[PDB]
Amino acid sequence: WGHEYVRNLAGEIAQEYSKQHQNEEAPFDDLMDLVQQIIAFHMKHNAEPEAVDLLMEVEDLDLLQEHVDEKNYKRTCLYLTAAAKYLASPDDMLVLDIAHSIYMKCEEYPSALQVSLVLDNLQYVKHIFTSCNDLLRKKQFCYILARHGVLFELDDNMVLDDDEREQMQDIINNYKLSEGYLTLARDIEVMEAKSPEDIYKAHLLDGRASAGATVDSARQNLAATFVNAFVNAGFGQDKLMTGPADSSSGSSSGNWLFKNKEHGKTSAAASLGMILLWDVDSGLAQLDKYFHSTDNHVIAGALLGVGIVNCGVKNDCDPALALLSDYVDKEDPAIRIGAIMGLGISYANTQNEQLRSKLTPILGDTNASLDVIAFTAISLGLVFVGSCNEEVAQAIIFALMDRSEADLGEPLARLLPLGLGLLYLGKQESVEATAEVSKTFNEKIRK
Amino acid sequence: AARIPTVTPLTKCKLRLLKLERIKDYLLMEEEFVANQERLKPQEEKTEEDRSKVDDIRGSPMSVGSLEELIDENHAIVSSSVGPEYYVSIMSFVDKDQLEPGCSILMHNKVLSVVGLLQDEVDPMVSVMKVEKAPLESYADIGGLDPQIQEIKEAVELPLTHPELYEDIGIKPPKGVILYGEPGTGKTLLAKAVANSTSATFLRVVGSELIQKYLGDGPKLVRELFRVADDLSPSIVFIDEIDAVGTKRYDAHSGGEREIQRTMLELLNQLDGFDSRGDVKVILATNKIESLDPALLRPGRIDRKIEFPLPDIKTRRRIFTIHTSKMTLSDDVNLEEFVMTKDEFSGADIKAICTEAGLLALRERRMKVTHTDFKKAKEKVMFK
Amino acid sequence: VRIAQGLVHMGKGLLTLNPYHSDRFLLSPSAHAGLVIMLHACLDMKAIILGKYHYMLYFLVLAMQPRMLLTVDENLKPLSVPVRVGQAVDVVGQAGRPKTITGFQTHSTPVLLSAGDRAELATEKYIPLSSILEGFVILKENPEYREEH
Amino acid sequence: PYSASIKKVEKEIKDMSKKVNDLIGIKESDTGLAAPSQW
């Protein structure tokens, strides 16, 4: 009878279903048979969006799994993915699961992996890996997971070869990311380090500053250090921090480091941690030289740099945890803050229970400075993003009640709610209970 | 009012729904922000207290003044309708967008401060030349020639038909089209179709109407026609009987030839002067172009040249079948018999013959027209 | 201003702060958390960043990733293959097999992908195992390709 | 499919826009008067 008849029937069927759902007294089988026939006709004629819309208005999306062909799955799945962005929580979740089912039936595991990653369900990822028999596809999935920052410990039931398991564990650990970045830098010829002055292009501003005395402000030096760290991040070599001492002077390379004050020294040390990004072997060796400094600020900065270096890269030796756990217990607030932040940055989204156990007691210590507890909350949130672990949320809430009104006025009090929210990032419906609990907080913070 | 002009979707896509939802949310937020002002500090009705206070502040009796200059900072200089120049300032509701010489500014009655503007509904020159209703039927009622119907369409309507075709070619419509032809050639009949089909404003100018009796007047009339047409809207203004520029001499005008010459120079300036006239088209016709000033025709002021010849022996058939559409003529005579009656029967000749035949049939109150009526009309038309 | 200038020249143009991946479909929790922490610290500039906590900017470490599209052979070695790079186009609802990229320029080996730029292989010799060409892509030699001499 | 669903919603929003703008005052077309939110 033509496509227009089918389209008008689909619209009228949607309306009839909408009104019958409010009546709850009409038989469904007669409508279901016509809906199935309409879906088959639409599939045969590449009118996939109309079929998807009809099945959405009927809520019987399960029928899609039977009428999807090898020539029709791409457009259908793209339409489901586009619709999911308009669908809200519960509908979007069911739609994503059905799209994942269509994908597994269609044997395109990469898109299934992406959809499961959106769902944040590790069981579906495990099922996808089990269903895969191609080693190269498994390696690509490991690369994708490493990009997403999710640790997937390959169980022994997944691969029968130990060497391949080690190889994909290294791939997940982003070991080859540094090599790839270095290869790209070599290809573009961007190896040469750029000094902060080159970015500043001071020669272009000298038209009106010829009368300014050379006063090296500490803040200017800190800005220079920050710019130097940003520009030369991941290149392994720097002209200001690690440049050879090739000028007629036997003075330690730390001349610029000692020009900064306290927190400035910490920042200068963290610049070294950035410069050796993703390079664990050389980064640890270079930071070992600064671990011997008598300045507590330099030690804290070195710990934070160690945390930065292992950011996104996991080593089976776990140098970060072993090194930082010894400094976490130290009384000095600066060293404790540096160690905590390094642990949080290096172990972001890892969901390690050992870190939870080591950090929770710090949150309950009333003698700890506000800085320490705020950074502990931030690190706990970073480690447990999207996990909805009730224990960490309860610990942060307990820390929040125990604050006097005076502490609430400091800006640092605004970071504990930030950490608690970070614990709940990306999970919509689970946060209503926590909002209800938070309604009990003091008025100045409650909102 | 002009809240959102984006209608490019023109479908049931989610983008249109999202845009509408965002607009509704913004409107709701604005309404909520506005409502709280009265909820917290209404302080007045805001509906009639403001209007009443404005009426009691501004002079209740507002006079009919005339703005003559511009003073931005709480001031204005005008002349009292009695004559006394005033230094009336600007009021709160001034909305100073009509600050041009001539628009009456209404001042207060107590202190004579500017109270209100003067809505203007006159445009005397434009009104004494504005076409209210369509003159005749569609172009099909012209009949026979259509050598300029396509040409005139391209010259005027085609720019207004879909001005992307001339845009895609990288050019602007032709400057002007001057319709010159034999006396009674139907040039006015061409303007009839132009108006019945026209889409924009049209102005009619009697040819002698450009020459006034007082010296210096004619240039003023030309400048005023230009201002009215241009300042009003996109227009197609036809100054018919352009030969009357210097052909006919009248004793009413104080000036002699140097007055028609001045009027022609002013017309030329107004056609291709020193500014941007805008989107204005000109279509003029004349029956004696041999005397028209050569400068008023150079490509750049009057561009398209159109010549209208007498109806053709083949076109005479369509002309006759047209001008006698609704006549209850008896089959006694055949139009072809009078078709060749006149060696140079122009278009007006056919209409005159038909009208005379109708009148003759009327004198006897008969229902149809006989061959003898046409025979007696033909002699009375051509022979006089 | 100096911090902003340094950020603009991050990695000399090789690293970005994009929290999204795979055509803006996947949100990385770590990068988002770092960026949100940095913004919340910036909310109170004078007290937080200009005070004793200049180091809160190091939460940005989580959000930085490289702009590299490196094609890799089965033997895990880098391979230079021409790649077409251009702005992505939403192909939903378009009849036929519309191209997903606006552009005909071909770039070999590691094209610096900008925000919104999508990549498609310019050669049929290699079948990309990834539907989206980003980061590490393992290329498999096409067994059906015949070199047209 | 929902041809009348979207047209009716758009018309309702368009009518409500005027129904709410008339509650602040822009109407009562004058003969040279400024906006009550202008004086």
Ligand SMILES: Nc1ncnc2c1ncn2[C@@H]1O[C@H](COP(=O)(O)OP(=O)(O)O)[C@@H](O)[C@H]1O
């Ligand atoms: N088909 C026709 N072709 C030409 N003129 C026609 C036609 N039908 C009628 N006419 C006559 O043409 C005249 C139009 O005025 P026009 O000839 O331009 O006058 P003038 O040339 O004196 O300005 C009217 O008398 C009208 O009746």
